[PDB]
Ligand binder design. Structure first.
Ligand SMILES: CC(=O)N[C@H]1[C@H](O[C@@H]2[C@H](O[C@@]3(C(=O)O)C[C@H](O)[C@@H](NC(C)=O)[C@H]([C@H](O)[C@@H](CO)O[C@]4(C(=O)O)C[C@H](O)[C@@H](NC(C)=O)[C@H]([C@H](O)[C@H](O)CO)O4)O3)[C@@H](O)[C@H](O[C@H]3[C@H](O)[C@@H](O)[C@H](OCC[Si](C)(C)C)O[C@@H]3CO)O[C@@H]2CO)O[C@H](CO)[C@H](O)[C@@H]1O[C@@H]1O[C@H](CO)[C@H](O)[C@H](O[C@]2(C(=O)O)C[C@H](O)[C@@H](NC(C)=O)[C@H]([C@H](O)[C@H](O)CO)O2)[C@H]1O
Length: 451
């Protein structure tokens, strides 16, 4: 018998998952508690705040001694990790670090989560999760003081990286016979042999807090903090990852829930370096290259954000008391905000259409008495793991005018352009890996500022 816990029946993955869970932090009605089944006190200090999460509110930590969350483990699950296998998982959101902060604070390692033995004059064995610039570190120290680490260096392209302001899922497995393995969003990101380490008792406390960080602006966000009593297999890591990916409220680009009456810049997943722009009022919209920021000495670059048109989302039919969140299947109206005026986005009756099937959207098209088709459904049709959205346009008899996307061509006498359209064409390509109808909604956020 080895180190993974209770073994009986070969059952569902979902069963194994629950039956090997030893701590599980959920947040409900603003209380942070453990729902694993065991009880473990969770003490929330005065300055540990709460923010929009992946499936409810999540824990937010700033850089002062008041911003902390501690779990005292129950006397049942208090040994476990001494010579045993274990797995740690959590969702994490770390803002994008400015080029000044990297110049200044890039070599500064500091803890965010840990459980390491509290001694009279020192600190002993256990584990820690920490960060250093744009690197994510996992650390193990045994009783003899021997150390093994996993250091993951994030991607230089910040529009696509894991440590640059979107929600990402972290999972870390430990097999005291082969290895420590780090995964991000279900994909093995690095590893380390831990054969030869001895005892790893752990402190009776698990501390969530910023420790030894020299930057008083740094902050992180953490959610569903969870511990298993075994080393999870790749299959199980995956079912755990998507179990959180409920479909009901849509998501903006950072992976927070989508909202009505708030400004968003659109970016097509298929060409993430173009922004959307406007020909003229009553006219159409087309794509253009976004300006970029690059800094080879710091090892960083990205397409810049916040240029283009600002879109706003309104309930097709007015609410009554209701939430501000947009669910999938929700029918909305889509406006463009330009020159202190809001113009509706839509398609008219016998308006221009590449090959009479791809209808070219117009912004604020007004006319005598000419039907302007604007009813849209905002849904998630594909690619669960990506914070993207699809828009379906209807006409006045509830027929499909199709999905919002783009098609290349050339109007009047402007130059060739990728122009915005609606067509039922996408409906036959839904299984492609990349597809021109997937869109990102991007709001201004304090965690991403352009250099
Ligand atoms: C314009 C177009 O290609 N597709 C629109 C579509 O068109 C047709 C038609 O093509 C059809 C078709 O899809 O409907 C039908 C046709 O019978 C077949 N041909 C054959 C024999 O298979 C083609 C075929 O499937 C294609 C794909 O188009 O074939 C090749 C090919 O020809 O061999 C494959 C080859 O690798 C390609 N090479 C390239 C360019 O890299 C070529 C190439 O794309 C074209 O050959 C050159 O443009 O395609 O599919 C038309 O061929 C046909 O054309 C008429 C012509 O218009 C007319 O003037 C002519 O008159 C006659 C001669 Si005369 C007057 C001198 C005597 O008659 C010909 C023949 O009839 O017209 C058809 C209907 O009018 O129609 C739909 C309708 O809704 C759309 O408009 C299609 O365009 C797509 O629109 C979308 C939304 O509007 C998107 O923008 C698509 O674009 C992306 C995307 O998914 O977003 C853009 C991405 O960057 C791109 N990434 C890549 C490269 O991977 C993707 C990618 O293409 C796909 O995602 C792969 O899945 O597309 C638009 O494509």
């Amino acid at each position: 018998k080895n180190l993974d816990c209770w073994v009986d029946n070969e059952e569902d993955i979902d069963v194994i998952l629950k039956k090997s869970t030893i701590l599980n932090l959920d947040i409900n009605n603003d209380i942070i508690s453990d729902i694993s089944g065991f009880n473990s006190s969770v003490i929330t200090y005065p300055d540990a705040q709460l923010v929009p999460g992946i499936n409810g509110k999540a824990i937010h930590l700033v850089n002062n001694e008041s911003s902390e969350v501690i779990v005292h483990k129950a006397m049942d699950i208090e040994y476990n990790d001494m010579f045993n296998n274990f797995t740690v998982s959590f969702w994490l959101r770390v803002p994008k670090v400015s080029a000044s902060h990297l110049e200044q604070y890039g070599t500064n390692e500091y803890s965010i989560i840990s459980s390491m033995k509290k001694h009279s004059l020192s600190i002993g064995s256990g584990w820690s999760v920490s960060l250093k610039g744009n690197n994510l570190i996992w650390t193990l120290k045994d009783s003899a003081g021997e150390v093994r680490q996993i250091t993951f260096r994030d991607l230089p392209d910040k529009f696509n990286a894991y440590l640059a302001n979107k929600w990402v899922f972290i999972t870390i497995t430990n097999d005291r016979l082969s290895s420590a393995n780090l995964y991000i969003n279900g994909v093995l990101m690095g590893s380390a042999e831990i054969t030869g380490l001895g005892a790893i008792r752990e402190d009776n406390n698990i501390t969530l807090k910023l420790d030894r960080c020299n930057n008083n602006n740094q902050y992180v966000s953490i959610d569903k903090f969870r511990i298993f009593c075994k080393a999870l297999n790749p299959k199980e890591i995956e079912k755990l990852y998507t179990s959180y990916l409920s479909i009901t409220f849509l998501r903006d680009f950072w992976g927070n829930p989508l909202r009505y009456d708030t400004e968003y810049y659109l970016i097509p997943v298929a060409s993430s370096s173009k922004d959307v722009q406007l020909k003229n009022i009553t006219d159409y919209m087309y794509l253009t290259n976004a300006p970029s920021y690059t800094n080879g000495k710091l090892n960083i670059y990205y397409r810049r954000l916040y240029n283009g048109l600002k879109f706003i989302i309104k309930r097709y039919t007015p609410n009554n008391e209701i939430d501000s969140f947009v669910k999938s299947g929700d029918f909305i109206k889509l406006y463009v905000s330009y020159n202190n005026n809001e113009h509706i986005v839509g398609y008219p009756k016998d308006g221009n259409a590449f090959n009479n099937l791809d209808r070219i959207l117009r912004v604020g098209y007004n006319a005598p008495g000419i039907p302007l088709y604007k009813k849209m459904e905002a849904v998630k049709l594909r690619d669960l793991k990506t914070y993207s959205v699809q828009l379906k346009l209807y006409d006045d008899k509830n027929a499909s005018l199709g999905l919002v996307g783009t098609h290349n061509g050339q109007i009047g006498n402007d130059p060739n352009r990728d122009i915005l359209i609606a067509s039922n064409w996408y409906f036959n390509h839904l299984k492609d890996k990349i597809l021109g109808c997937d869109w990102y909604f991007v709001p201004t956020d304090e965690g991403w500022t352009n250099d």
